[PDB]
Amino acid sequence: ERRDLPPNLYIRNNGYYCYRDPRTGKEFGLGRDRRIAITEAIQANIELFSGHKHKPLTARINSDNSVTLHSWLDRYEKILASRGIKQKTLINYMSKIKAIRRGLPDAPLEDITTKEIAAMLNGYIDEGKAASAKLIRSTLSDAFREAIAEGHITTNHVAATRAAKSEVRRSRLTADEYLKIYQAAESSPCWLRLAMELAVVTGQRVGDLCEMKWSDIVDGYLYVEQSKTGVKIAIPTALHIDALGISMKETLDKCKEILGGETIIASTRREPLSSGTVSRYFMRARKASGLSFEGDPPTFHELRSLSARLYEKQISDKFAQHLLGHKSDTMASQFRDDRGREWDKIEIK
Amino acid sequence: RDLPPNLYIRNNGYYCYRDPRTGKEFGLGRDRRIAITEAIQANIELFSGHKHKPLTARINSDNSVTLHSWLDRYEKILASRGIKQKTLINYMSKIKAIRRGLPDAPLEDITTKEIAAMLNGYIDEGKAASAKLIRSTLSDAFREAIAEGHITTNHVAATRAAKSEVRRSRLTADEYLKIYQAAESSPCWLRLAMELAVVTGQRVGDLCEMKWSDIVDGYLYVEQSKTGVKIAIPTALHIDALGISMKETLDKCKEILGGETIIASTRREPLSSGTVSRYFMRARKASGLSFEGDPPTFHELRSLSARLYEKQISDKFAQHLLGHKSDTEWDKIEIK
Amino acid sequence: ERRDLPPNLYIRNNGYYCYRDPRTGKEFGLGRDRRIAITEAIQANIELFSGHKHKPLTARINSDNSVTLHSWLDRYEKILASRGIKQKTLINYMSKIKAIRRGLPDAPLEDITTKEIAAMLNGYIDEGKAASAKLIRSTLSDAFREAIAEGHITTNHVAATRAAKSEVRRSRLTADEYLKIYQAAESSPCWLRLAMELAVVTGQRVGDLCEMKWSDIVDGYLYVEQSKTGVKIAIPTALHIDALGISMKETLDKCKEILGGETIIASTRREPLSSGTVSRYFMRARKASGLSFEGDPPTFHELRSLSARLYEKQISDKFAQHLLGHKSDTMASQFRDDRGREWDKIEIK
Amino acid sequence: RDLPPNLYIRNNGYYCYRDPRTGKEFGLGRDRRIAITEAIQANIELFSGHKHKPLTARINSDNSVTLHSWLDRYEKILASRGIKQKTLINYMSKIKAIRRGLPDAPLEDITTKEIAAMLNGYIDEGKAASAKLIRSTLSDAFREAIAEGHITTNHVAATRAAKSEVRRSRLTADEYLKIYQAAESSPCWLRLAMELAVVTGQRVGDLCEMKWSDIVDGYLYVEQSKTGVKIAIPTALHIDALGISMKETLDKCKEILGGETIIASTRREPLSSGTVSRYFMRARKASGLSFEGDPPTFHELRSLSARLYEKQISDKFAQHLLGHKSDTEWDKIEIK
DNA sequence: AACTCTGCTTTTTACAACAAAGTTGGATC
DNA sequence: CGCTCAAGTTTATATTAAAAAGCAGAGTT
DNA sequence: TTGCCAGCTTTATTATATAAACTTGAGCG
DNA sequence: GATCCAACTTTGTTGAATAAAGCTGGCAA
DNA sequence: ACAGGTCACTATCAGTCAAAATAC
DNA sequence: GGTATTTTGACTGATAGTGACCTGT
DNA sequence: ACAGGTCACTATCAGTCAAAATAC
DNA sequence: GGTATTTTGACTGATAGTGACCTGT
């Protein structure tokens, strides 16, 4: 007869015991009492046998009596409904939540770790969904605060994490290209044209463009109530874009004769259209024009950016700023940037 | 029988640890050896260590004051802050509010959660604003509570103040006229007050405070109850869009009202701030107009007052009359 | 004969032991062991007799290395000298320290309590030296920060407390009063007058005033380098204050003839003066004029405030701002404010 | 025996508790019973427990990390961030600095204190700025350390950044002239580079990268290496205060220098950024002028360039030229 | 009056991270 | 017909903090 | 011929604490 | 006679967060 | 028969307050 | 003469340690 | 004559490592 | 024929409990 040497467990020359995780190779100190070594030994022998632990009481206490991710998000949700926000803001957020449900365990909050979070966050970076991550993060983040504001938690695990910063990919649109798409838009219904023209001439948001009524015009002035920021403007029917040969007045009355409807921009059956279709068809003429660009191809909104860019040089910087329904002075210097396209010709000026 | 504290055994020989905090017990397993183990682990968590030095008489008694009892001294702390008789009461109301929202346990013991709990209570009934001030004050009391070191941490600070869109709607020129009209069944000063109010754009609270002694060589001296700003309004003002002249307003007051105050009762005596708005109110409802949100109120007259003075003379004037010193729609895109 | 019941200590009906602080009246729980009760009991009987406590090994660790106020303040000091600051900023701070030294215990950091801080802080309010309190506080605070920055501590006890808020007492000066003082200034040496006039016409800081050289003037413009903010200006020798009948040029040549020295403002023995004396004598003239004010009587700098207030109404608000060496938007408004004194008469304009 | 751990007795029958942390021993008294008491007290403080479950092997390990070992992987994640090769080495230099300032112990065990300690070391020597960047970086490393959860807490964050006053003095028009003159003993390109630099107000780093192929129909195309901004400088510019014409400067470069690069070596090849500034330096010293603080340097020329363009034509022009995008002594108060 | 010490009250006014460069002291081919 | 309460909303203004002063009552030559 | 649901990218503005009020239902002398 | 690093200092560029969009893919009629 | 847990209830527990028990 | 404070124990609210009684596999 | 508190000094203590010793 | 893992008994750095020495009253 020899020894009852629990596997993985070894003894030292004086009679001191260690357990060796064969995972890392690192030994561990137990004590002097064979009896007790033994015991702890076996416990660990079954752990390797299955990510299953005798988890400390500390743990098991704190547990059952404090949250559950999905369960709180569910409440998160409702709190948002309360904030008093615009219907779409909401759903943007909603989407992200959803995102989280699907990225994370429905476990207890404090038991969510930084790493787990980053882990899924990074999942979204690696696929090239940089921007996403930001918002996902951002929101998740919030959810927490508030969760903490309702004291289920003590600390935001997210805020320890780093926001992916995103270099914008959408290329800009040059005067040349517009004309080349204006041309391709031939096979497209007649309103796309006018919308285009209008778009550049008023430099207004597509969303708002689809909302203008013929009753919005009084004594040579087009009144617009911006949907996004609520700022109010009256655009004079006198404007003209010299670089592309478009007159606002001339654009507007083509819309009265050929489109005819309550909306300045209207469908072929005389009804107002959806923001999304207008960019949607502009998209088609983009592909149909066949031009090549670096990164993502420009889109409709781009029209508003070209609009400001040609307004800047035609009359003034202060003018481009005012038409855009645009107040701040951090962006007339970021709605001016070319993003690598064509060379800011410094003049003798 | 070495049965560690808070851990108990069952019929079969099943072991359980009981959190005394909740009362719920917990499953362990079958080996006393390992039960024990986790047992003490547990009794370290809730209880890390044990004794105390009876030199923690001399420490742990005055450590616990309790909400209500501190609020009680909070109060008196405020009394010394040196502020306006009403301000105090505002606050006071808050407190009370709190009294009725929270247990009377010790400070240390109150939870973030519990707090918002009630806070939210106030949102959900639609009394946002209140929330704010409740919060905000609760907060304070805590601050100074830690000021005197009964605690460590402002639990409040972690919570969020609701943000409140104001509902009181504004009053337009049309409507005022419509009310001035309904004001017929009302005692005569209402009208005068109204006019006065629009014309002087002054706070009802001060309006009720104006003496005929306040007028010297064509100038009305006002000492603003609220901010202490001093102004002299010239007897020459007139609001064109509604056809009221200050001077013609003022002399109607001396003839039909006759009293120490410019605005007075039918019994020749000074009126109370609240009555003024109060009767205005009745005229509101008797006019029968509808609006969006809550109906405008007397103060509103000061707002209309400025809105019509901005257009008639200048924005600089509106600010001057109101009692304002500093600064804090349909834009015109010019041809330049 | 019966028993050895240590005073303050009593027994219960079943044999449970408690000590009664007679200080409070409140009892406390010991246990079952007569022997051990006894023990803790005597410990307590000592305590009553000496502030002295058998304090913890706990305590007794953290203290032979976790510093001492005065000791750290001494090091605070030094950090300050390194911050790269103006020679007097320094002393201001310095004075406050000192303040602290004399307000508080030379104990260990974490042992300082908020209340102790308050207590002294209040000492300073109660005496009416409101503002002081502020800066004391402020700095103490800082000292702590940094102390925390070097980890002797973990928590700013300071920040818990609140800063006295100070209503400014210095009354302002009206045009009439200036005349009144200009008059009593007769008994005073000649430069006083000139300085006064100069001060109001230049609206410049006395400190800068005393540092102007005749070499600072070229081609009808006076160059000034403000010592306080470093702002650089050129005042034209053409200025005139009509409400008081003072011409910059006429004022300046008075200085050349009767004062004669390197400095535009100079002593009777042709040397540069000390900022303080200037104010100092102005004071004398103040007292000797005999006028009554509410709160504290205005003083020389006040000349700068008068200067702006009469510049405001004479030419423009934009001009008053340019002359001062003052830039932003919280001040050419917290300088046109009145403070009890004058009633803002509104007009028909 | 009864003798509790870390408590030792002396030859007399004197009791002491030895703090294992420092090594320092502590006095208690003569009574064993009391000794013991406070003893274990002590022994809860440092260690309450002593035990773990060996089932806390599966947590102790991969938790256990050490500075240098992490910095080691810190490094690697930097390489992935996608940045310009120099940025990286800046960073890496910092790293190194850290290695040399701090123990290679485990993260959790690094104290605020020690950090400051070393940071201040860099202050005291007058290397203000460095401290900042060291800090800055160290901080980051920690952040992402926690991002992978070996730690809880950024001890850095509690520390403060030295704030530093810029020492490099400015260059005035007179001085440049005096340097241009001393530059006579220097190879010919120096002069040209200098002129070019002022006239183009371009980064030395970019100056040395300009090709004769960069010029089309009177315009010099420059792609700024530092921020990627693209500009076309017209060959018609001239600086009046110093008598230098861009076109005249450019063609002295084609005849005297002759090479693919507009600025070139004596052997017709492209020069190293560093050399250019380097020789400029020589001419500085050789000019013999005195300055307050650190002496101006080549880049200085770009600053001069802007200062003289501001006054000659416009503030909007100087902005356009330097690849400056947005806005970020004496101002004549005329009587307006 | 002239000159420094001192305990006080006012005026003024505002950076932090990331990036990605630029300046110069010695160690190498 | 007016009051003072109370539970609620609304409007005005001062908001931190680390730097540079300024100003008058002594003590001392 | 449109129509909205569902998963991504982009475009914009930017605030919180103190004081000190005013509103207005209720019940009170 | 120039190179390359390594250690240091600059200078330009973006900084969070919430809020409100926009734009192509399909499966639904 | 048994893992995971709950109840309901008396036999210490941790303590108060006013009447008996000397002390200023 | 007579009120600050010590003690002493019947009067008292509460939790701990048992075991009876769920429950859901 | 001793409270307070420090040194040195080897016998555990808590391991790592590359040979020796079977598994796959 | 020849790589994964377990043991295991000399090789190694650091503390823990002892006393042998300090020293300021």
From Swiss-Prot, chains A, C:
The gene is int. Gene3D superfamilies: 1.10.150.130, Classic Zinc Finger (3.30.160.60), Intergrase catalytic core (1.10.443.10). It holds the Pfam family Arm-DNA-bind_1. Residues 67-148 form the Core-binding (CB) domain. CDD domains: INT_Lambda_C (cd00800). GO terms for molecular function: DNA binding; hydrolase activity; integrase activity; transferase activity. PROSITE patterns: CB, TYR_RECOMBINASE. Its EC number is 2.7.7.-, 3.1.-.-. Belongs to the 'phage' integrase family. The keyword DNA-binding applies. Homotetramer. Interacts (via N-terminus) with the excisionase (via C-terminus). Part of the excision complex made of the integrase tetramer, IHF, Fis and Xis. The active site is at R205, K228, H301, R304, H326, F335 (o-(3'-phospho-dna)-tyrosine intermediate). This is Integrase. It comes from the Viruses. Keywords: DNA integration, DNA recombination, DNA-binding, Hydrolase, Transferase, Viral genome excision, Viral genome integration, Virus entry into host cell.
